[PDB]
Amino acid sequence: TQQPIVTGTSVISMKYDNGVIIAADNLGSYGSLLRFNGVERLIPVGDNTVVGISGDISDMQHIERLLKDLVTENAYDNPLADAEEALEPSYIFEYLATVMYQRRSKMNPLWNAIIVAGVQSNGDQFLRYVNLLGVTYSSPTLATGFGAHMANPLLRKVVDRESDIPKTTVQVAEEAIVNAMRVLYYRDARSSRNFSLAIIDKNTGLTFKKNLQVENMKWDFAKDIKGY
Amino acid sequence: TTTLAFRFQGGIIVAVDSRATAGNWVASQTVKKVIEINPFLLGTMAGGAADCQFWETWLGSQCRLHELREKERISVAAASKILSNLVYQYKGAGLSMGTMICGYTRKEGPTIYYVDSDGTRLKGDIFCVGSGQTFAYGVLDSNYKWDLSVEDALYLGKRSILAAAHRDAYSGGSVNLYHVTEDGWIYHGNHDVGELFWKVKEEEGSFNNVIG
Amino acid sequence: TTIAGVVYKDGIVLGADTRATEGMVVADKNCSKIHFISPNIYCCGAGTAADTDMTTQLISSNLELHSLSTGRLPRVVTANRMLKQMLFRYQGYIGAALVLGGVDVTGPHLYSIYPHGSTDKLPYVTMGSGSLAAMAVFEDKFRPDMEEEEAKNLVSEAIAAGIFNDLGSGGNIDLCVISKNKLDFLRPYTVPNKKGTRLGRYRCEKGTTAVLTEKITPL
Amino acid sequence: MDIILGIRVQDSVILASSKAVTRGISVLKDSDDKTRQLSPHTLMSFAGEAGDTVQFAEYIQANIQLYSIREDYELSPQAVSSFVRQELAKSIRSRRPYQVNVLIGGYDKKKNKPELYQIDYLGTKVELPYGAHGYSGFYTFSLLDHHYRPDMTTEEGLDLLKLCVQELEKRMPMDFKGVIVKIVDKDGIRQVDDF
Amino acid sequence: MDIILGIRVQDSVILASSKAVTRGISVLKDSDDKTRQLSPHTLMSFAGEAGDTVQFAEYIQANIQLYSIREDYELSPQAVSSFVRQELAKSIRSRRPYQVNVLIGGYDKKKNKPELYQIDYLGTKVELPYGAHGYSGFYTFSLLDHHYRPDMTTEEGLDLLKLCVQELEKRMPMDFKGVIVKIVDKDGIRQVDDF
Amino acid sequence: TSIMAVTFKDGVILGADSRTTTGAYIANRVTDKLTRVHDKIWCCRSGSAADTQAIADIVQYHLELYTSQYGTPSTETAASVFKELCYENKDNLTAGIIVAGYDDKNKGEVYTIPLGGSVHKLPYAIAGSGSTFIYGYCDKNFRENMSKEETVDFIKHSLSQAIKWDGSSGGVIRMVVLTAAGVERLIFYPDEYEQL
Amino acid sequence: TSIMAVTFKDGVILGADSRTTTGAYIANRVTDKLTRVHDKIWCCRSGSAADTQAIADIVQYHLELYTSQYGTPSTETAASVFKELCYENKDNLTAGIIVAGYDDKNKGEVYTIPLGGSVHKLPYAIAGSGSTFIYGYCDKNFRENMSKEETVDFIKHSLSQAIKWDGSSGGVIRMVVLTAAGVERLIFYPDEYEQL
Amino acid sequence: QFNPYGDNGGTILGIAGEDFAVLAGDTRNITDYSINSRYEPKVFDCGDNIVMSANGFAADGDALVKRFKNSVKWYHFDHNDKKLSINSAARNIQHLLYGKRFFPYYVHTIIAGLDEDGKGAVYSFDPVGSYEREQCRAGGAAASLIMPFLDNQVNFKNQYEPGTNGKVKKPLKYLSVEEVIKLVRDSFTSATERHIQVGDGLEILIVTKDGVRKEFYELKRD
Amino acid sequence: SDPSSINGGIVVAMTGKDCVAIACDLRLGSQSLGVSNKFEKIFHYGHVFLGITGLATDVTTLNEMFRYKTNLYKLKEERAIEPETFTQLVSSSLYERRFGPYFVGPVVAGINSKSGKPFIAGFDLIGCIDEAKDFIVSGTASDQLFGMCESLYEPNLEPEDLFETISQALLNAADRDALSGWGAVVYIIKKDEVVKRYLKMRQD
């Protein structure tokens, strides 16, 4: 048993026709204090998987080292480490899910919520969630913490069920994700303007975008507010 | 839950209700609260459903290993003490167990041992265990004697569960009857309280607190 | 519960879902949550349901007496004050969470009132368990000075977000459009879910139940 | 306090009440009468919190006796039971509630019928053929379910009651020092001295 | 459990132990023997936490019987009491202590003297002319202070004990269902059947 | 919340952010924490929204009734009425209020009233959860008798930093200028202040 | 406690106050919170004195044994050893450490390690109870590639303000300068810094 | 303080016919008032014609299913590819559950299949391993809503022969797979109407001697 | 010590074609101990029927209170109170005790004598009105009743059919609850006749 000290807020994600998108802001909060403004919470594993992490940042950094160490270990005695025997999203997730549930079962959890986004060998989209309790689930859209309440409603209007995934292009999906990140910046007190986004496509591969910003911000209506 | 077992002229009667509860939620009315350990040994289940079912099933395995090792039927005294010494090891961990180990051997004759999760182990002629034990004791004590026939003893055990099934909210469903003699145990049916109550009311002229 | 309101060009559009719950159980699927305060002022209600009904009824009664005495239509600011001051005095124990909307001599006004007696005066608000789902829709698509049918659609869309994504909310969508020239009380505005069709007829035939005694008395 | 029982038969209501008054590890008295006559044909037994019991009983007794003098008339058992219930139902939401459970045995002279009412400290009233308060009921109710008939005589009722006291003396953890038995019928209230 | 008494007279130690085993609102048994013979001239009565009591008694019994077989010799009452004390004194600082209080009545054949030892669950040992565990002592000790003489016979000791049981049956709150009485003297251990 | 009031040559300016939260949810991103208790006596509100709103309303009522009988109240008098409510109801209130007003005799005045209901007259005052982060900055950068433009910049830079570090603060920076000329309302949006 | 470390053109400077308290009693007014773990790798200590002293001693031992086998450790390596101790014993430690060192390849480097045992490489870092009051100031006044004299002034002015507002901070301002030239110890007394 | 348990909602239902058995479950997964997924299956084919669901805390449910699936695998390895009968599976699951008696799996487990005589079988377990064979069993959040309906329609509880004065009960009988699926679908639509945690979709696994078949139906998404 | 589940009990009401039904069990207990099998939970004031579940002292008190209030009503108004009006009176009376409530679950049932319309309603302990076209449920087996009613109920049932539906709803719900049962009463209510039937049910 501990308590989380330095923290990261929402990680959001969705599927689209050819792959998956995942995003998270670059803030490390220290309670109400917006302490660290340059924290990367999307951590790529190979060229087919991105693991987005929220919650305790010290525990995130521990998980980052476990993944880095997983890549090293897979390469050992593996001539097909960059081909047929490369790490899959499903392998990386199952490992983390095993760890998370083991740690909760020893009453010493890793204080995080994690989304593993990627594309598999056969072109299938992979998107799955795991948290500090070892609870796992998949859905066309996934979001952690605050994003579950505000991002999912918006993202589900683009992909409401499985059959909407082939109908959704990468442009429509990325717009929705960037739009959701704006809404979260208005309304989440422990969020920031600066964020990272990662697309994993079956054709174009892994695109990792840094130093994005929320823009097109509606504040004009604020001048007309007089008292309560 | 209401479980009873008593000793008389022609052996041992064992009777139990069949209701399982999770608070006020009636989870089942077709539950087995008697465990058949061997042709000469029965175990009753009160308290925690899992704790009783598990450790009394395990008891049957330990009784089997005794008769393989020793080429002889385990005594009721020894069988009951395996269970009592087991629960005593788990004492303070929160096991919930109120049980009766009933059986016959040539050595000791018909014998009943009460065993519970806080370590108590008692030999005796009459026992009632469960949330409805008091209701069963009331009918059983006031109509009991060694004299009793096998027909009357089976009925009294049936009737004593019915009494508790009526008054106790957590007892009911049906009555499972067992008769234990020198030759072994004999099952004497599953009697639904739904029908049994009205039949006993009509034929006996009792339960006048009831509209019907 | 998902309740919401917006200030549009000509006036106010209020919105609400229709699910009433008893813990995890739905007690009423088509329950009305938009309450009458005065002819030009209505009030959506969330939180403790009895507190919401009794607080809006009391302030509606007192405003009726106020309006009979003064001989003029009541204002939203007085509805706001009377609700506010009462709720403050009871220090949060009256669990009424209201979206108050109406149209005065001074134009359209929209308030959110909280149980402890704080109010915010805003161009759009959402309350209840589905407020975050609904607020996401408003932050996505709201702009000032919308036309009527557009504002209707935005509120409806915001309530829908609550219905589908929040488990506490459900059922139909009720709207209330308030302007200087009219009041449109739309119940239901939309039926987003059809009632589930049952495949079998489980109703028992006559004589099936076992009766003891019978008594007939005429009136 | 502790044990109070009641049985309504054909022509009378019988109340049995334990004699012990225990405080701590000492039985202070073994002859305590846990009953008050409310009117000539109405008797109330009581059990519960020390002090509260007698204070409540005597308060009810004064009020019924006042009514009797004012109207030169005896209130029915039903009427007395409803008055008592209401006093307890008021009490339960007071600053300090009466923690007293009662049985009211009465003979209604207008109906020529015995009546037994069980009322708990919350003000929960029921009319019953037989009643009990506290742990006593857990043994007696099932016993009476079996052996009770609605047409019994006062003698049959007393034997049925002996059966209850015997069962309580066998299975109850505490020594309650026996019971005082009282009969309420058409001729009023009398105490059985040899029980 | 509950009542265990002991009286040492001129030529014997007498132990009296209550027969009731109560759990909740039910007296499960009224014939329970709360004693184990440790050796031919040593008897131990016990009271305390359910399960713990018999488990501890039988464990001590096994150990003394093992000693007897090994050395072909009977340990003195003093020696047995010191062994028992130490086992309890170890136990009190265990993860789960034995919650068992004991009396040990023995006849030392080398000294030709009766001996009575009172030991509580902490391992507090005293040799006494008369002893009690639990609430029993609060009535009996003062009574025995008055009526006990060191030169009494076994018959006088039994009458003195009847006086104690009578006082407990009058003033104790719980029904303990009488006592089993056992005498330890030069000829060993025997049970009085009519008490 | 990050609020402040600053006296200068021509009078006094009040400043505030526009964020109200329930835990980490922003219930209102466009809040007005600068409230009028008289024509030229205003206050900045911090603490419980319900408490500060109820207090400000009572004070406005008191000063309206004062004006009816005795004419324009002094800024000191307004602060005394706030204090009286805050002090006597300290056990039931979470209110940190800065009171700021313009007299023609006394010019600009600032009174701060922390949680206990004590009163402190100061050249400038900062309050709210975000104030902690700007004590160092404000002490180093405040000068007496600044101009209007300098004081606007001092408040804008200060609340900019308070907002940057405090999660409970944000949205727009509202200001109210109190001078002999009258009452001026200023607003500054994120796209301006964030990149200061 | 008010501590900080700041990178500049020629390397890095560490700074700290000298106050240790038990509640409101000052147990030591001349404390040294800047401690050597290697020739040119130093740390600033905040939190429990006993915890930070025990950690620093273990790290100094680790780096001495590293040096015996593999030569001079990098500043990153020193920070990693601190992190490893802080992270794995998070439940039993109250330690907020800033690690600062000078390499010739990497120049000046600052790593901060807050309560959870996370690591953050930064251009400059502030920590301790007094740091809260200077976030605004330090963010406004820090520039990259400052001179030695500018960086000394930046630390002196910053800790001056942290000391002024924080009761848990005070005494002297100690500094340690880490450059290619060597190790320099600086001290600044109240009579100088208070009137800045 | 850290709480190691959570509640993921959902509800499950098992019915047994003469030569078949069904095990149904809704596909909605929740925490508090939020939906995690509209399609997250929790009824699984475990091999040897055994279907299983462990409803409650989904982390414990997945762990248990995972361990039992692995238990089937090792049963084949250790006993010459012998088929694990439903009664042997049940007893094995008791030991899995009771092994964590003092740190339970927060779930209600149900398994379905065919017994060794080819007849339909359903077994249900409490969180610590008390088990029983039954005809009917609903588990999870809406069990209390569904179960009394099942008693009335499957077991004809409380119902008597018309004109018989409540003297002759209704004769029980076996239901066809068509009839059973009607009851499952209607049980879940009723539960969806009145319980907030139940909805989105219904997945039924049907077990005959020919193997394991699936059917899927939409449920209300509000 | 949860006041609404000490004594136990249930009430259910339904509407049909030009009729209404209201039913209740007969148990009164003290936690596990069954005390009375004659404790009816349905009362009437003229043609308006009121069922009350929950703490039995409050059930009795509220009956006595509404008898009082409807008697005075009838004397002053010179007519019997109608279901819609009575429903409002129940709500007002319960909310009067907002911070010290009666621990009850009342259910109104009846036919408006002017309009001929069947009317049912339910309340929480604090007065919130729940109106319904179809059915209202209350008591310790309310979950069970909700499930039974939602699957068995259909609109516009004839009085004889509606009797079978409501009885089967109550009986099967009561048998899945430890604290409910011990006998049952059903009231079938038409425009100018009321039929009261006692049901045979299992007595455990």
Ligand SMILES: *[C@@H](CS(C)(=O)=O)[C@H](Cc1ccc(CN)cc1)NC(=O)[C@H](CO)NC(=O)[C@H](CC(C)C)NC(=O)[C@H](Cc1ccccc1)N=[N+]=[N-]
């Ligand atoms: C009556 C005993 S009583 C009321 O006097 O305590 C029965 C005896 C009994 C029932 C069933 C069997 C064999 N199948 C043997 C004896 N006891 C019960 O009904 C107990 C009440 O204590 N019920 C249970 O143990 C139930 C059984 C379920 C089938 C309903 N289970 C539980 O209570 C557990 C508790 C639990 C454990 C871990 C985590 C969460 C909850 N499940 N639940 N709820």
Ligand SMILES: *[C@@H](CS(C)(=O)=O)[C@H](Cc1ccc(CN)cc1)NC(=O)[C@H](CO)NC(=O)[C@H](CC(C)C)NC(=O)[C@H](Cc1ccccc1)N=[N+]=[N-]
């Ligand atoms: C949604 C608000 S929410 C879930 O987002 O907080 C509705 C709002 C609402 C519905 C209906 C009306 C009617 N005009 C007005 C507003 N609120 C509810 O559904 C609440 C949930 O909190 N439900 C209730 O308050 C129910 C009323 C039902 C009978 C219909 N009452 C209870 O649940 C009471 C509450 C209570 C009050 C005091 C003390 C204890 C419990 N529970 N009970 N009993």
Ligand SMILES: [Mg+2]
């Ligand atoms: Mg029962």
Ligand SMILES: [Mg+2]
């Ligand atoms: Mg307050």
Ligand SMILES: [Mg+2]
């Ligand atoms: Mg901010």
Ligand SMILES: [Mg+2]
């Ligand atoms: Mg639903």
Ligand SMILES: [Mg+2]
């Ligand atoms: Mg029942």
